[PDB]
């Protein structure tokens, strides 16, 4: 139930059982937003976002839920979208200052720590609130191969084979576990990433939605691109038939 003491008004304050509630309250905005998933294959990383459309007046392409943070890394966000656009602009500046200092494309194990220590740094002070956005990052390279990391609003960053963030993250993960993705190729999982979105979408409550897809992998020379209008339409047909 409720608590009237002020152990949840700042993220610079522990609870008397050792919890930071303002972090745990920040991952309720993520747990209420629409579902974004990302599955890694043997040759790349595919994202897929259930993008809710809130008005028919909005143009197709508004509220871009799949960002490009470098020319080899993508980003699929959940939660409070205005905070996600600020962590997109931090992830771009971190990837930009890496090439300006070290002279090559930033690794994804290191990009998702520079960003995760930016998210963590706002979970410490009474002057700033934690971010209301979990997000994913996926890249592909000759050196590192395919990698997919997720960052929580606490700042923890793990590496995943498949991920889900949003309100149907529990139902999406049990669909991603049905996949055996370590042997499948990158084009065959765009069929499957779009399949899991149409499953976990509750069309009773949420009215209507677009589908955003974006890969990064060996079939586009290791750059992150939005899935074209042909391959996204086929995956939206293989899903809606299933």
């Amino acid at each position: 139930s409720s608590i009237g003491t002020g152990y949840d008004l700042s993220a610079s304050t522990f609870s008397p059982d050792g919890r930071v509630f303002q972090v745990e309250y920040a991952m309720k905005a993520v747990e209420n937003s629409s579902t974004a998933i990302g599955i890694r294959c043997k040759d790349g990383v595919v994202f897929g976002v259930e993008k809710l459309v809130l008005s028919k007046l909005y143009e197709e392409g508004s509220n871009k839920r799949l960002f490009n943070v470098d020319r080899h890394v993508g980003m699929a966000v959940a939660g409070l979208l205005a905070d996600a656009r600020s962590l997109a602009d931090i992830a771009r500046e971190e990837a930009s200052n890496f090439r300006s200092n070290f002279g090559y494309n930033i690794p994804l194990k290191h990009l998702a720590d520079r960003v995760a220590m930016y998210v963590h740094a706002y979970t410490l002070y009474s002057a700033v609130r934690p971010f209301g956005c979990s997000f994913m990052l996926g890249s592909y390279s000759v050196n590192d191969g395919a990698q997919l990391y997720m960052i929580d609003p606490s700042g923890v960053s793990y590496g995943y084979w498949g991920c889900a963030i949003g309100k149907a993250r529990q139902a999406a993960k049990t669909e991603i576990e049905k996949l055996q993705m370590k042997e499948m190729t990158c084009r065959d999982i765009v069929k499957e990433v779009a399949k899991i979105i149409y499953i976990v979408h509750d069309e009773v409550k949420d009215k209507a939605f677009e589908l955003e897809l974006s890969w990064v992998g060996e079939l586009t020379n290791g750059r992150h691109e939005i899935v074209p209008k042909d391959i996204r339409e086929e995956a939206e047909k293989y899903a809606k038939e299933s």
Partner: protein, 503 residues
């Protein structure tokens, strides 16, 4: 010396002789020049010494020697002397003893206009060239004695002056409009239901004596105490949510619930169920639970007017289980106070062998027995919520030089607050629900090792409650367990001489 001698004369005053109040009105009646300091000499003597609790065959040797001489003085002053506050302490005592022999109707608009004026309410958006003569004022606790002794008349004239009083000041009881006035104004709500109930005890259940009873014409009717609650129920529910606490409202709401439960309990529990599950505006759960505890006697007792009371017993009792949280301690104390004041009224016994064919169960009473299937689910979920209340409150040894050995005052209350509120559940409990809950205590307190400072006094007190309720079935398994493991862990090696024992 000042208060002992007044409370001695007050104890000797009803035994003064009948010819000895005109004897008393002859001595200080020459001191009543209203210009010197010698008048409050007389008016304090009048408040202390004058006999008012006289039998009705002696009122001609009583107040009628001095009432119209001195209420006519009181209505003519319009300053506020130091001796006006003595006459309201005199006229209240005159009113509360001689109910039905004063006609307060020629003076009742002049009385309520000064009780209102003694609240000193800011009115007018500049509202003051503030008179500093109003330091002296009316003790409203003596005024509550003086309103209450006027209500039972046939012409219900004082009743609408109470409805005219509260409805003129309802905006000041609102929890956004707090100020300097609120200390007299919460105190008014604390005392008028406390005093109407005592007048009802004085005329319905008190045994007769040589003190004169109220006449049958001046006695509070069922309409008169219904119309009293309905003009005070809206200011007491706004006082429930005040910034200064909910202590004065819940003491008002208790005494209103003795009179008219069907009119006072549903407006409270309509605000209680949204308070136990809100996660926003947490102040209600501190304040609504504080008000159900005064309600609690009138709530579990289904009378001939409010029989749906104990239907609200168990759902309020189950939804209060998240209130035992190791994060608030203001919620946790008022939750321990909440469940211990319910689980000393209702036995925690399953009713399923009575849920067979039996014509004793009414429509409301059969609805109770089917809801008693969650009594075991209350006690076992009370323990799984209190075990996390303990195991997350163990003492952390941070500083490497010192040893914090004192349980603090805020933690010593949570020991005794769980020593109270668990020993009252587990006593008011069937032996079938006891022994399935004894094992929950034993399988907790013996599979763990607690720090003996904070969690040591606090687990063992929760076991102490399990033994004081059935000492046979509980001591069959604790003292064989503990003695078989002390002799294992002490006398095996030479741990007689040591520096630190095994924990």
């Amino acid at each position: 010396v000042e208060n002992i001698l007044k409370t001695l004369v007050k104890s000797c005053r009803p035994y003064f002789p009948a010819d000895a109040t005109a004897e008393m009105l002859e001595e200080w009646r020459p001191l009543m020049c209203p210009f010197d300091v010698t008048m409050q000499k007389a008016i304090t003597y009048f408040e202390i010494f004058l006999p008012t609790s006289l039998p009705p065959e002696l009122h001609h040797k009583g107040f009628k020697l001095w009432f119209d001489e001195l209420i006519g003085l009181w209505v003519s002053v319009q300053n506020l002397p130091q001796w006006e506050g003595q006459l309201v302490n005199l006229f209240a005592r005159l009113a509360t003893d001689n109910i039905g022999y004063i006609d307060w109707d020629p003076y009742v608009p002049k009385i309520f206009t000064r009780i209102l004026r003694s609240l000193n309410l800011p009115v007018g958006s500049s509202q003051v060239l503030v008179p500093r003569f109003l330091t002296n004022a009316y003790d409203i606790g003596h005024a509550v004695i003086w309103i209450t002794a006027m209500m039972g008349g046939p012409s219900k004239l004082v009743q609408k002056h109470l409805a005219g009083l509260f409805n003129s000041i309802t905006s000041f009881y609102h929890p956004s409009n707090n100020g300097r006035w609120l200390n007299k104004l919460m105190k008014l709500l604390q005392r008028l239901p406390n005093s109407v109930v005592r007048r009802l005890h004085r005329e319905r259940y008190k045994k007769p004596s040589w003190l004169t009873p109220v006449p049958d014409s001046h006695k509070l009717t069922d309409q008169d105490v219904t119309d009293f609650v309905q003009c005070i129920i809206q200011p007491v529910l706004l006082a429930m949510f005040s910034k200064t606490g909910s202590l004065e409202a819940a003491q008002a709401l208790q005494n209103l619930a003795l009179m008219r439960p069907e009119l006072v309990i549903p407006p409270v529990l309509e605000r209680t169920y949204p308070a136990l599950e809100t996660l926003t505006e947490p102040h209600q759960l501190t304040a609504t639970l504080s008000c159900v505890i005064g309600v609690a006697r009138s709530l579990v007792s289904g009378g001939r007017w409010f029989p749906e009371g104990p239907t609200h017993m168990l759902p309020l009792l189950m939804r209060a289980l998240p209130g035992v949280d190791p994060n608030d301690f203001s919620k946790c104390m008022i939750t321990f106070q909440f469940i211990a004041t319910f689980s000393t009224l209702v036995p925690l016994v399953d009713c399923s062998s009575v849920l067979q064919e039996r014509n004793d169960l009414t429509e409301v009473e059969r609805e109770l027995c089917s809801a008693t299937a969650e009594f075991e689910d209350f006690v076992l979920q009370f323990m799984d919520r209190c075990f996390g209340l303990i195991e997350s409150s163990t003492l952390e040894q941070t500083r490497e030089e010192t040893e914090t050995e004192k349980m603090t005052h805020l933690e010593s209350l949570v020991e005794l607050g769980l020593s109270s509120t668990f020993s009252t559940i587990l006593t008011q409990c069937s032996k079938e629900i006891f022994m399935v809950a004894l094992q929950k205590v034993f399988n907790f307190s013996t599979s763990h090792i607690f720090e003996t400072r904070v969690a040591g006094r606090m687990v063992a007190d929760m076991c102490r409650a399990a033994v004081k309720c059935c000492p046979e079935e509980s001591l069959k398994l604790f003292v064989p367990h503990c003695c078989s493991v002390i002799t294992q862990l002490t006398m095996n090696d030479d741990v007689l001489n040591d520096e630190e024992l095994d924990k």
